[PDB]
Antibody, heavy 210, light 210 residues
């Protein structure tokens, strides 16, 4: 089962976004679908539901008059139009498949950030080197940034830390890998940093210090 | 439009049994068997734990059991293991066709083997310096329990510091990062800078120099 989300990013207060989710690995047109959200601080809030046929449509109290859910059963997609957005609509939005009055499969979610600020891509610096090498992903906005190492081939010893909000208003995080010292000359270490809200993607090669 | 109510925190020990309450009204938990429970680890989407009040999906450990009585639902976890450390959410169908989540419960699993923090400290990258900026990065990992205090020194005087709240690695332990932001000349001035990490009754300290 896959539920792949899209849409999201930054939007000015009062503005609007469409979110979509594409579904595979199950018979999409036989299930009700939902969207659920989660603000950075707090919990899950169910947002919306659409019946199998698209004929019935339900909304949480704090969302009515502003959100519209729709689905397309020939293209296996689900959509949430979110309007008149306020800073408190800042959240991760998950699409969720219904089993039967429960939700058995969730998407990984897209982060909607509602602010009057503007978009800014990351500057990616190497933390050069058992040794540890890493990448310092600095001064971006808004969240989120994803980090992989060597196109996701490298898995062990990887820890990407949470982001830090600076008094500037920008985020910064780092990703670190722990590698056998014996390979600093033979293996190549590349950090791949995706910042979808700015359509920027940056690959940095990390090499041992001079 | 009010949520199902749960305890915000529960601290228990390895091997113990815990029970988490979720209270609603007659329109949700009372009149329907539409009660489901979800687990959420950090940086990941919720997963379904229990549906139809007491049914376990395959794959879910049988240490997890659900029930209800009147307007109160119960999630019970037998033989707490370290992996059970997660957020738990109650959820229910509600008359009118909506779903409503519980406010959430954070579960801490106490009696785990204590691990001391490994500290790794990075001077500013050369490329960052070329961009007229300095930033020291202190990465802390592999420590249990999760409480740490991070201090910074310049030579030996105490010190632009931002620190992440510790976080799930989370096999057994935690990780955090602290950043010291400097102007490159302030970096060029002092003989050394230190990162001090205080955990339990130990403090691990590291030092870099220009």
């Amino acid at each position: 089962v896959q539920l792949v989300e899209s849409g999201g990013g930054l939007v000015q207060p009062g503005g609007s976004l469409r979110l979509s989710c594409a579904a595979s690995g199950f018979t999409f047109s036989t299930y009700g679908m939902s969207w659920v959200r989660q603000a950075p601080g707090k919990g899950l809030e169910w947002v919306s539901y659409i019946s199998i046929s698209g004929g019935s449509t339900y909304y949480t109290d704090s969302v009515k008059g502003r959100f519209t859910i729709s689905r397309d059963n020939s293209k296996n997609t689900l959509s949430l139009q979110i309007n008149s957005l306020r800073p408190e609509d800042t959240a991760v939005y998950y699409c969720a498949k219904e089993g039967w009055a429960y939700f058995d499969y969730w998407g990984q979610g897209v982060l909607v950030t509602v602010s009057g600020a503007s978009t800014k891509g990351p500057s990616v610096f190497p933390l050069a080197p058992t040794a540890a090498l890493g990448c310092l992903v600095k001064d971006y906005f808004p969240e989120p940034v994803t980090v992989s190492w060597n196109s996701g081939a490298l898995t062990s010893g990887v820890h990407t830390f949470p982001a830090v909000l600076q008094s500037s208003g920008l985020y910064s995080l780092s990703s670190v890998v722990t590698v056998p010292s014996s390979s600093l000359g033979t293996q190549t270490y590349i950090c791949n940093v995706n910042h979808k809200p700015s359509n920027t993607k940056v690959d940095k090669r990390v090499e041992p210090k001079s | 439009q009010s949520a199902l109510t749960q305890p915000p925190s529960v601290s228990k020990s390895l091997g113990q049994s815990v029970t988490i309450s979720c209270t609603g009204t007659n329109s949700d938990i009372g009149d329907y068997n539409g009660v489901s429970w979800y687990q959420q680890h950090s940086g990941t989407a919720p997963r379904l734990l229990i549906y139809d009040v007491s049914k376990r999906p395959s794959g879910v450990s049988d240490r997890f059991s659900g029930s209800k009585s009147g307007n109160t639902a119960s999630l019970t976890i037998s033989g707490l293991q370290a992996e059970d450390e997660a957020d738990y959410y109650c959820c229910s169908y509600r008359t009118g066709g909506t779903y409503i989540f519980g406010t959430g419960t954070r579960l801490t699993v106490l009696g785990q083997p204590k691990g001391a923090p490994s500290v790794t400290l990075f001077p500013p990258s050369s490329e960052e310096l070329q961009a007229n900026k300095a930033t020291l990065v202190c990465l802390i990992s592999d420590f249990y329990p999760g409480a740490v205090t991070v201090a910074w020194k310049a030579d030996s005087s105490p010190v632009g510091v931002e620190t992440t709240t510790p976080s799930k690695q989370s096999n057994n332990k935690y990780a955090a990062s602290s950043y010291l932001s400097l102007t490159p000349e302030q970096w060029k001035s002092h003989r050394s800078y230190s990162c001090q990490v205080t955990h339990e009754g130990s403090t691990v300290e590291k030092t870099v120099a220009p």
